[PDB]
């Protein structure tokens, strides 16, 4: 219910980290009470509001967004890979509830694509953000290149729709990428790498066979996947495997992991927060959005 | 030049009982739920069958743990544990050991107003 999340509504602050910090919580909790439409009992007055506290930091971010159209915490310290592809990432989501400048997001897409893609498909960063606590699941992987990967890999497919026809490079981008996590994803120890790269490739539909076989049976229960560690790593971790399991259509796996999703009663918020919040009110909203 | 019933207001009533009809320059007043702020008249009257503006209840915030430790800041009296601030209250937050008040950020002092706290950050130092 809407009121055990009242506190995702909040003002964006801060640099160009701390900024899109704030802004996550507030761009998905509008998003997941639109779709479970939820403003009748939470309070249909309450939106417009969220709703330009969304705007608000839309345009403090753009006080962030480099001549290149990449971002970083100030324009003086060089763009990061995982921050540009996580502004992407919120932005996309974003476009249904505010006016986001295209130039703006595929701006964005297309520096990604251009300068930080390796020739074998991975992504590549070469200047961490400072705030790791943001990154989730990703902060300390030993399948990196993997995992930033995926991630890159997520928001430019979230970003089709929109930058496809400003951008003939991106399905190109994105089947360079799709090759090296299939290429790599058997080998693959860590279940936090399977889920996101899991649901990367079920967007594109290039998770079956033996890759599906592994994504399944790496989960535990049939209900999540953990590793050992951060707990909301394994709450972010399973909203990418929910999201790839709507993907797949596997309406009959979902029930239990949903469960589980629910019966952890997390309401996003709290340090280091950024990635499980929005994945999984991410995740939730999508699961409302198909079933049955 | 009667008037009919006072109209409703969010969060606040009538001090007295509601009658269908009220004579020329009868008056009612208003208040509040607990926490919420009187802004207006509290006092309306029928003047010429109709009756005068009526206030707005404001909202009082509730400060969030959740936000505080994402923000990285904390309380800066934390045997005084407010939950709630009425509209016009303020609150001093502190940096958590480790961040400084960033940038852009608002003051470290911060008033309530109709449920809406802006609160501060603090980055890494």
Redesign the interface.
Known sequence: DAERLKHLIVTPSGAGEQNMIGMTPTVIAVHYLDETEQWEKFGLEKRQGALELIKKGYTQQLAFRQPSSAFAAFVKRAPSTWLTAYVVKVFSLAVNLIAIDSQVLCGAVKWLILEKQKPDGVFQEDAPVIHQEMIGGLRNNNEKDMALTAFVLISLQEAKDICEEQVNSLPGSITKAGDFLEANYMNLQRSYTVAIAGYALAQMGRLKGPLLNKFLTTAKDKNRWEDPGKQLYNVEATSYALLALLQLKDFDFVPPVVRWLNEQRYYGGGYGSTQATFMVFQALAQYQKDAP | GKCGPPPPIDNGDITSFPLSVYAPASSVEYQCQNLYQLEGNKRITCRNGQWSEPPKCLHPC?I?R??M????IALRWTAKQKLYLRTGESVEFVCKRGYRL?????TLRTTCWDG?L????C??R
Do not use: D, G, L, Q
């Not at chain 2, 960033?102 to 608002?106: D, G, I, N, Q």
């Not at chain 2, 802006?118 to 950050?121: A, I």
């Open positions: 509730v969030s959740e936000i430790e994402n923000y990285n960033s940038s852009r950020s608002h809406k802006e609160y501060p950050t980055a890494k």
